[PDB]
Design a protein around this ligand. Sequence first.
Ligand SMILES: Nc1ncnc2c1ncn2[C@@H]1O[C@H](COP(=O)(O)OP(=O)(O)OP(=O)(O)O)[C@@H](O)[C@H]1O
Ligand SMILES: Nc1ncnc2c1ncn2[C@@H]1O[C@H](COP(=O)(O)OP(=O)(O)OP(=O)(O)O)[C@@H](O)[C@H]1O
Ligand SMILES: Nc1ncnc2c1ncn2[C@@H]1O[C@H](COP(=O)(O)OP(=O)(O)OP(=O)(O)O)[C@@H](O)[C@H]1O
Lengths: 278, 283, 284, 277
Amino acid sequence: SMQIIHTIEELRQALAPARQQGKKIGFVPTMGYLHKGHLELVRRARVENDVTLVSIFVNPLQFGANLERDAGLLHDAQVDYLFAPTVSDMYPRPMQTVVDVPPLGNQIEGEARPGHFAGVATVVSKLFNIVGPDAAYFGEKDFQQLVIIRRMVDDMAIPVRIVGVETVREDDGLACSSRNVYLTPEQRRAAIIVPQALDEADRLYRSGMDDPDALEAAIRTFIGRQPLAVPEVIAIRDPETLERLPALQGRPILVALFVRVGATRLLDNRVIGHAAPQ
Amino acid sequence: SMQIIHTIEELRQALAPARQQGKKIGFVPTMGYLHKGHLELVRRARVENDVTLVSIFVNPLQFGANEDLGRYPRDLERDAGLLHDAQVDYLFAPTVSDMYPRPMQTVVDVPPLGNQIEGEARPGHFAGVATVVSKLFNIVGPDAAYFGEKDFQQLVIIRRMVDDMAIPVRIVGVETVREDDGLACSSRNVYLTPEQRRAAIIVPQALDEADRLYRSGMDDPDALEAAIRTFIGRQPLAVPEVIAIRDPETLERLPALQGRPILVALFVRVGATRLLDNRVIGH
Amino acid sequence: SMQIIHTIEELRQALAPARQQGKKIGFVPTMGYLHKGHLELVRRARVENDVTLVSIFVNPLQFGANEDLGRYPRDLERDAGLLHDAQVDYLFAPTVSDMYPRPMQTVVDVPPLGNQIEGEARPGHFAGVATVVSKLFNIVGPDAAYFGEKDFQQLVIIRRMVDDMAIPVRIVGVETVREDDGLACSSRNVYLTPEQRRAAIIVPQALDEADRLYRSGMDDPDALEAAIRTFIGRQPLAVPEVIAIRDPETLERLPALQGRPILVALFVRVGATRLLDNRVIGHA
Amino acid sequence: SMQIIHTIEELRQALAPARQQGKKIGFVPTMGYLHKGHLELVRRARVENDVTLVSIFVNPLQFGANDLERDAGLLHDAQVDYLFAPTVSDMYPRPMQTVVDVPPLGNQIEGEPGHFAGVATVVSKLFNIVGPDAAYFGEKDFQQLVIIRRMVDDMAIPVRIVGVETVREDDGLACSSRNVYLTPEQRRAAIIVPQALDEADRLYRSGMDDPDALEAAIRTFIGRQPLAVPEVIAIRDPETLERLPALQGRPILVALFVRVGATRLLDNRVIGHAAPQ
Ligand SMILES: Nc1ncnc2c1ncn2[C@@H]1O[C@H](COP(=O)(O)OP(=O)(O)OP(=O)(O)O)[C@@H](O)[C@H]1O
Ligand SMILES: Nc1ncnc2c1ncn2[C@@H]1O[C@H](COP(=O)(O)OP(=O)(O)OP(=O)(O)O)[C@@H](O)[C@H]1O
Ligand SMILES: Nc1ncnc2c1ncn2[C@@H]1O[C@H](COP(=O)(O)OP(=O)(O)OP(=O)(O)O)[C@@H](O)[C@H]1O
């Protein structure tokens, strides 16, 4: 049976026998509201580790200053431990410590801002300290986050392997997300334009397109065919630095889409192309 | 039980004790989706060494910008089941992130051997191969590594690389393992429809043709080539991008054939699949 | 024989048997040029742990653009010799390339503690410290780590960082070790010329005086600061960069002194040497 | 006393029991003409390792296609365990067809194409031959070091690469086998080299923010000395060796190539250091 723990000290004691046995611990951090993508993270973790731990915590540090279902899904997925702390279990007094990766975090949505991704980097560093995992699994769906965590892990010599899992998609191609539920039936069928826009970006790249503005314009007009879909951001960037590119061909590129359908923000991304020998 | 390992650090730690105790490590690098031919490399490795390690990594460096990297077949679960049964000690199965945490700026290449034959059709290809293989050898530190003769240019290039760079590994070439009806086993064969799979028998027969032609006393590189390019023309589906007659050692073109081994190398596309096959003929 | 190691991967491989045997690992992080204070941290570590690891690394991140990184004292042969005598099991002595093989893009900071006091005179200094200390704890994975109370603010920050980030290390503060005339032991003391070294006794003397004034009942923080300033100014070779009278836990300014403990923190420049010393005076 | 070995198979036999015992092997590759500099490289290797091995080899792959006594002497005094002194035929029995290069790094400063392929290839071969735990190089040759570090990372070569601070003469001038060629007048003029780096240091400390301004200030400073002609003043990112958009708030490489009469003198300094983000 999956054990549910709430406190840091209870988690540490719960894992002490796995540590004594030299068991590999796989960790999937989440904010709950679990869907099939989360379950594929769990499935990867279980393939590669002896023990699998999922956290559910809605972290206030990644928002501004202002469950039985989930457990059931994790129970059926054969998870060994669910860590579900309250805010007070995680933060009994306010955090004064901040971890950030400013040069990556200030890209894309991170524009020119405070630590847009400080909350994420901080809470993930803390969760790694609590869990002591061997490997941690994240969706490629949240690409910027993943690049940031990798960098943080390398810089800080955190002894955890970071595994990026390919985006899991509903059967019409729409990226799995808990926000998909909000879409009206009409909006849901319009939403298919997002994954189709990525296929179009791939087609254009394979045909030789080399100017990032031309790719952005193509994608914008493509999505625009569906008037219920308004592209808020179409980011074409280096997948390593997340910076703008002077050209596209001969190198891999990240195409990140931020698209509003009705009131709902839909996100998707794909890395297109790959590196040649020097 | 076979241990599946995903990182360079973990793999070296796993192998460190055996290496200290002088145990022989045999290594079979692959791009996965394993077939009878891979399993023969693994058997050779198993009988010849104390410790057997197989790598499964679809190496992006050896795929061109418009080739089949996106659709290259992958099934690690299946691959792993086959390797457990084969009594493999270690499966190294890294993600791209584990093999190439940063974009590679270093390249290993053997331009004389690599720019011709398949490398005319696929520029950069063998630099990708030579690079990943040098890195794999550095990671694993094997005593012996096992490559199939079906990828004959590859094998010659790796032998030369290993020699030139004084890499302390014994390189072992293993005879092309063939399906029931003579076709060279290859993961990419799964792109072929039944019709194409029937049409692909051209390629092994074409090598049997140049076999007896050489045995008949033929002696002109180009007369051997044209006899091949028309013997394969008999099957319409085949769109040869390379028919090559070469010195099996230097891969350079010849003046005459008789009384010297020649290599016949066929890069023949049928449908969406670029089928490769080779034979060394004579002595 | 003490093992001397230079790379992260090498250190983790050297400590793996220890973890396999359930040994407790004591950790003392330093910037080298070791003094008696360092050696007391080591002695304290060895009492409580099976294996003791010292790091020596002059961390560029905790030096500002125009500080003394280039001249900070270094003598690894002398340090190694002292640690061998001290029965240390591991010395981790990386170069900058071994600690930072590529430029860091990550930072750890505790801004509400780190921007006060010494942090007012050295902007960013404590982000440098938090960052390297977090990395070293990841690299070493110790059961306990030992820090001098002489760097009082640093200790407060490291304890807070450890609690905040749930880092599973016990943090031990070690009482300040002093030279015979009361000067806090510090590797930078080697900068002091004879005349500066003689003048430097004004720092511990000023803390004595702070204590004296507090015992007499002085209750006004501004008055205490002003008295300490005048007392130090009697030594023309000493220039106070910070005289801070603070809450010892929050490091914030106080309204009154009596009936609670106060931190008196002095950062005082004598020539090219900025001396630091601290004392917690009174009680709750 | 120091063994001298010439062939690959001999070198491997020599090291095999040391390697079996987990002894740490420190390796110092050279082309001979040894000075105080090389001896520091060797001192470091000996402090950090149980067995020290120095190679002397004038690699043709570095050069265009068209005294072992004094050296081995100093190495015997320095207590080196092994000298590896192959002939061109011992290293390259047949001609090399394999090439290792790090083109993005190799195509900067001195490389503008293939310029550092010779060095990468020989260092890779040497590492394969010796199988060392650590290898020591002078920071004098910065570009080389940065390239070798990248190659080792990219190729997963299990060797620690250690950069050693440039050994310097009485007056600051960088130790070099090229120094012997200066006339005494030229040698007194040559101090302008490290003085130009000090001045580089000074201008950066004073807040100079533009790399062309710095280059022109350094050009002019070296002009003060007519026996000294500056061929190249490279102000670059020490990681990528590329030109910089600005100087302040980031470390900078200042690499000088200066002509003093006939002889080429090189020196460099990384100025500044990384602050927290
Ligand atoms: N029909 C076959 N018979 C024998 N060996 C084969 C056959 N097909 C492939 N092989 C060998 O199995 C090994 C793995 O081949 P695969 O196509 O999986 O990629 P790979 O080239 O081996 O990996 P890399 O190119 O990165 O070394 C190769 O050495 C290949 O020559
Ligand atoms: N006089 C002293 N008595 C007791 N401990 C001291 C004394 N002087 C320094 N220390 C302690 O020795 C340890 C090492 O100090 P050092 O000056 O070498 O830099 P550090 O602060 O230790 O290293 P880092 O800042 O990277 O943590 C510190 O914890 C410091 O507080
Ligand atoms: N003044 C110096 N201080 C420290 N090291 C130096 C100095 N001058 C040269 N060196 C170093 O000595 C080492 C070998 O020098 P040498 O020029 O003899 O061979 P090399 O060209 O480095 O060998 P290879 O390029 O084949 O590796 C190099 O790492 C070089 O940077």
